[PDB]
Amino acid sequence: NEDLRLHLLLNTSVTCNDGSPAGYYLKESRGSRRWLLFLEGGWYCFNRENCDSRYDTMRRLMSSRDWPRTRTGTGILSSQPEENPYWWNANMVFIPYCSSDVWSGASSKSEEYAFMGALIIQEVVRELLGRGLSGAKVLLLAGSAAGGTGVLLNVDRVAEQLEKLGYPAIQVRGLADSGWFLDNKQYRHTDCVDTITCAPTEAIRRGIRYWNGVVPERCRRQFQEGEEWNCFFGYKVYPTLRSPVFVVQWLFDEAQLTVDNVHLTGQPVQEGLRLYIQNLGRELRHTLKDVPASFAPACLSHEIIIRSHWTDVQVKGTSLPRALHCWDRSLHCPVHLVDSCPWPHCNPSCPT
Numbered sequence: 001n002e003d004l005r006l007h008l009l010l011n012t013s014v015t016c017n018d019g020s021p022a023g024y025y026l027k028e029s030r031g032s033r034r035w036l037l038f039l040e041g042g043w044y045c046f047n048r049e050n051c052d053s054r055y056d057t058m059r060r061l062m063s064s065r066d067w068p069r070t071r072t073g074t075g076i077l078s079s080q081p082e083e084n085p086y087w088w089n090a091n092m093v094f095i096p097y098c099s100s101d102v103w104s105g106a107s108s109k110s111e112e113y114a115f116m117g118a119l120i121i122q123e124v125v126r127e128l129l130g131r132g133l134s135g136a137k138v139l140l141l142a143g144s145a146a147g148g149t150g151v152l153l154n155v156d157r158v159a160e161q162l163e164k165l166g167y168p169a170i171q172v173r174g175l176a177d178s179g180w181f182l183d184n185k186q187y188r189h190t191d192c193v194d195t196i197t198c199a200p201t202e203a204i205r206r207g208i209r210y211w212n213g214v215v216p217e218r219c220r221r222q223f224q225e226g227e228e229w230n231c232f233f234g235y236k237v238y239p240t241l242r243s244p245v246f247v248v249q250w251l252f253d254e255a256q257l258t259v260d261n262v263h264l265t266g267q268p269v270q271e272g273l274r275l276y277i278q279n280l281g282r283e284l285r286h287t288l289k290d291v292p293a294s295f296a297p298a299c300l301s302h303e304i305i306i307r308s309h310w311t312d313v314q315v316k317g318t319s320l321p322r323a324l325h326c327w328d329r330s331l332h333c334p335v336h337l338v339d340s341c342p343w344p345h346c347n348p349s350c351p352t
Ligand SMILES: CCCCCCCC(=O)OC[C@H](N)C=O
Pocket: 040, 041, 042, 043, 044, 144, 145, 146, 147, 149, 181, 200, 204, 232, 233, 255, 303
């Protein structure tokens, strides 16, 4: 039908965690010169014991053995005008997340797991050139959660790749959704034993060495050798980016609260935790005041750009698809939309 069809990478040396071939889903649209490449999320694992436990409970995120042959685009990947009013006719690409490395892993493997997230992106771009990308006018690299952080790490690498390959007319852009995190203090400190409850700084310090991860070169210059973990955090890597990037971020991101050891039950929140949550949104609000193209509602949620109801969230009377359209036209109707109200779900258009 309108579905994206699975393609496995021809270079079988670029694999998922377990050695199965990586791949991508593609839906071609011959009349359009716009391309949407989406990076999937799904946390990470930074040592053998967590990656083994991840392999037993969430096998889809470390292997391609169970991928379906087709997939339906949703949200900004949907081809239905009612669901994607501005970009429904674009070429759609969906890259599944099977490297557990926040799309940072490079180099090859010895014997346990392989971490080739940055090489998977590179190889998809190579193959897509033979399937019509060579004629593109705009390449928008998008992603959610871990894929959103992966956009910040890879958007300038794709730009330089396409220049080196001889396609300087393609305008490369980035869209990072729910990948803008703070290396802050936990609400209640725990020891870095499990994945989702290890502090953000320590998680990336261990991960980048375990994955052989790479960061943008211009950001690596700003921090001491051995402190490359800084470049995994949006407000530190953003000032050195060269491609234009639109930042979508819930002010109270639920994944951010998870690594901060905050667990929301159906109880009434006490003070100090209410203060902690309130202080989080203010610091994230502060990091965005110099980001011209941003969209930050004051909700407690995670991810949105490939959810079907992304057309319903609005900040100051402007929807998310509208803001992306205004940003699109400005590169050839505001684009800086951050909520001013400081408590969660003060925006009436928050999801449920
Ligand atoms: C600074 C690094 C923090 C990365 C946190 C990533 C969280 C995530 O990737 O969330 C996945 C979501 N549950 C599914 O898509």
